[model samples]
Target: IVGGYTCGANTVPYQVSLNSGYHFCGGSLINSQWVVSAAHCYKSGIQVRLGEDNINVVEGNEQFISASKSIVHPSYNSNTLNNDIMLIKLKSAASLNSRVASISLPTSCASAGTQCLISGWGNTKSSGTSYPDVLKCLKAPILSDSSCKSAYPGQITSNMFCAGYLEGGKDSCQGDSGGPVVCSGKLQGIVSWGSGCAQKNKPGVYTKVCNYVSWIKQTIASN
Candidate 1:
């Protein structure tokens, strides 16, 4: 839907749809009982659906789970969009199958030129009304922080990264927030914030997962 191709069913096992009484955000299953998403995308009555390619229809492979708890990064700044990651603890552990699984987190930041995959059920047009019921994916190259800074000037922070087509028409769009940005088979970033969907010279912004790995581990451990 969102400037991308429709993904094959079950192609991305770790991808999940976040339903807060309404389909709003995307998320990734990190473990059987845990999911990672964006802090700013948080909503009450959160529900997650695993192995779901189509949000409108329920498939046999899909697993629905209510969130037992959620933890948003304490330092998340709504203004600057720093530390935009969050974790969701499930009410129960997810049952694994061929269509459902977890993804690995990155130990370091993604390279500037790496190609990454992002999938979600967000809007197709930047500010349009249509949203895809089926999942959509796009390939985007990581943009160097300096180049990204040139477009966003004083707003890009160390905890944020950018990826998209500089030519303008391809990226994660509206309603694609909290989706995973997988680079080289590892989770490197989280779709945090973006100016408009896909615009010339304005790449999609993401929360750098590498910078907050320690904080994620600590929060899960202490709780």
Candidate 2:
């Protein structure tokens, strides 16, 4: 994450790394057997690493597990990036601990101006390849739907919302997609896309988790 600080070890226990030899995306553990991420990050043979802090080091708290299955939102649109949520079933239930646990999903939608915390291990720059070894976090306020629509006309959808600074500063960057955006201690958004890293008037767009709570529950139940 750009313009963010490194997260303390075990502080973000729900956060997980989506890896295929190396970290490619971020995900959140919603339950012992399910992880939520952006549909766009989907790929075969993804390994989920829980309790991860630094990707470059072998942290003793880390739990590496294989994905049993992944279900992308049926209505996901690649062109417009709508309904960008996805669910991955773990090969086995994770052993919950202080360093490896699940986070609660949001029950209500976060309104405009709500401050949220976004965490990831993505690039720190807008233009270069500078992925951080440790997880980083940024606090950004949610923008109004009207304000978001004005920033990216014809692109913002009801299933999507924007956050971060309008004048350019903090944001979730590449490789951060599918990371968690927690508001009021619940998972509210999933990093999806943005114009650039943290460009002025172009805040980072996220998949509104509130819109897919039902889908997530049903998918988990049926599977």
Q: How do all models score by TM-score?
A: 0.97, 0.99
Error of 1 at 130 (Å): 1.3
Which tens-of-lDDT digit does each residue in 27-79 have in candidate 1?
99988998999998888899998989878887778889999999989898887
Candidate 2 local lDDT, residue 9: 88
Candidate 1 has its poorest 10 consecutive residues by lDDT at 126-135
Cα lDDT tens digits, model 2, 1-223, are 9999988887999999999999999999999999999999999999999999999899799899999999999999999999999999999999999999899999899999999999999999976778889989999999999999999999999999999999897899999999999998999999999998988888999999999999999999999
Give the alpha-carbon lDDT of every model: 0.87, 0.95
TM-score between candidate 2 and the true structure: 0.99
- Please give the TM-score that candidate 1 achieves against the real structure: 0.97
- Candidate 2 error regions (>4 Å): none
Question: Given candidate 1, what's the lDDT at residue 167?
Answer: 78
Per-residue lDDT value at 97 in model 1: 77
Worst 10 residues of 2 by lDDT: 126-135
